[PDB]
């Protein structure tokens, strides 16, 4: 909680041309004409075995 207040004060003292270079997110296509700004996190799960119906890409992998 101490270090998180530090990060959010270094970010305010940056010019606008340099905010754009250090920026998280990627424009994804999550629905019909719905483009959002998303953050990808990976996971490994060995306990629930189901078949997969909901997915944005048939062909997996990083690309």
């Amino acid at each position: 909680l101490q270090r998180a207040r530090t990060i959010l004060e270094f970010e305010k003292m940056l010019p606008e041309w340099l905010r754009s270079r250090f920026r998280m997110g990627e424009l994804c296509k999550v629905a019909d004409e719905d483009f959002r700004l998303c953050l990808r996190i990976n996971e490994v799960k060995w306990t629930e075995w189901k078949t997969h119906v909901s997915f944005l890409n048939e062909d997996p992998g990083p690309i």
């Binding site: 078949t51 997969h52 119906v53 048939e58 992998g61 690309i63």
Partner: protein, 114 residues
């Protein structure tokens, strides 16, 4: 115009459009050169870049009527003697080289289609 309708109908589980298209796909090869019957029809069902066929496309999108679709696709391949080379196709892309339709049926946890 004929390849794109097959991949679209096989994803959404449309058995009514699949039959009449595959009969129309059959009728086009009778009024044809008639020289290469296998090597033409393998080009019609298979994407060129990724190497994916229509049998791989049906299994990636599991519907509540998938196993009736697969039986239509295999029974269609009986009357042209291409059942071996249609059921044993592979990706050519370097990120998926060697994956067949039997790797997709086991990964999707399908016991009866396997």
């Amino acid at each position: 115009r004929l390849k794109k309708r097959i991949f679209a109908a096989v994803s959404e589980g449309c058995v009514e459009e699949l039959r009449e298209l595959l009969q129309d796909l059959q009728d086009l090869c009778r009024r044809r050169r008639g020289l290469d019957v296998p090597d033409f029809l393998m080009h019609k069902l298979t994407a060129s870049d990724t190497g994916k066929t229509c049998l791989m496309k049906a299994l990636l999108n599991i519907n509540p009527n998938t196993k009736e679709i697969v039986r239509i696709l295999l029974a269609f391949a009986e009357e042209n003697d291409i059942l071996d080379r249609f059921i044993n196709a592979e990706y050519t892309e370097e990120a998926y080289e060697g994956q067949t339709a039997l790797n997709i049926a086991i990964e999707r946890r399908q016991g009866d289609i396997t």
